[PDB]
Design a protein around this ligand. Sequence first.
Ligand SMILES: *c1ccc([N+](=O)[O-])c2nonc12
Ligand SMILES: *c1ccc([N+](=O)[O-])c2nonc12
Lengths: 190, 190
Amino acid sequence: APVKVFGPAMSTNVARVTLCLEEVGAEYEVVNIDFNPFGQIPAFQDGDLLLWESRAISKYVLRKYKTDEVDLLRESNLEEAAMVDVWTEVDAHTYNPALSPIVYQCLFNESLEKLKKVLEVYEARLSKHSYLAGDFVSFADLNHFPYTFYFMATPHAALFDSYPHVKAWWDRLMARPAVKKIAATMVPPK
Amino acid sequence: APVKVFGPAMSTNVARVTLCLEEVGAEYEVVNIDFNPFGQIPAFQDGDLLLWESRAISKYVLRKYKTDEVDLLRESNLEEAAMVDVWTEVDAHTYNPALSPIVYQCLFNESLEKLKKVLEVYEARLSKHSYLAGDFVSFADLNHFPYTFYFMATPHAALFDSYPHVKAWWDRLMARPAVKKIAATMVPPK
Ligand SMILES: *c1ccc([N+](=O)[O-])c2nonc12
Ligand SMILES: *c1ccc([N+](=O)[O-])c2nonc12
């Protein structure tokens, strides 16, 4: 029975969730709604269950449809899950925040030094591991996709070229069937 | 072998972690440091493992020392863990943000209408369940402690009295041995 996502497709918070759904091979429809006790978007129906908060929706999607093949949270492995969480929280508290000003400015219209300084660190991390959480893809890696997608529409895309391990890491992420499927979806309704 | 927490005791981000440690009965020292690749506080050493980001540190503490008796994340139970995450994310994105202005203003020196509106919802939630994540305490409940602790030092403490289920829920939280032990610790060094 298909699970349902409500919100705009191109929305960073929706794409986080459509991505997780694609990654685990779930069946799902996306409904765009107009104008759940804060009245929040995205929302997500799994039959009787209603969820809001795209982190909780995603971690739910990744738990419901976990296989040995597709295990992107890694809760079975203590140190692994810790690193998934650490870099999830770095995406949320440091990375995403550096990109937003530049996406807002530089698509609908300072923070570039913070990101250079953040990229030095991601570059170090990614020189010692395939992926952020260690030598395996995880939610941490997937979390970076929405905000970074839009960053590469801007004329500051080329900055990743001073951070080769970050370029290669990103390219690798762009290469994934799921990631591509969603990237297509991130458009206004015409 | 004791795990180690670095940071100021009275810090909201440190207390989140000392609380989780107390709740699970772990052995731990707290070191206050001066002036981990963003150089972040709090930090946490488990022998060879170093963690930063207090959400990841806490979720780690709660996983390492999970018992059948003390299971505050509930990853074994799909819907349960979803609700733990949902209300964790509500504390982070809505609740905590309503309190900070009032703690900053009204201890070192508008947002009161947002919180009234947030409290209406918590009151509803808490009228239908013992605790936020359903009829069992969890990380979600514990997450609220630091920022709310300081809110009740202010002259707006009495506002919880218009939200009885939220008053009773809070009182219940204040009653816990762990919660009290930490509350004692949340003082400057004299
Ligand atoms: C994006 C990038 C650069 C500049 N610029 O003037 O250097 C811009 N101005 O408006 N958007 C952008
Ligand atoms: C806290 C609470 C109220 C007021 N007030 O003037 O109404 C304050 N002024 O500075 N701190 C507070």
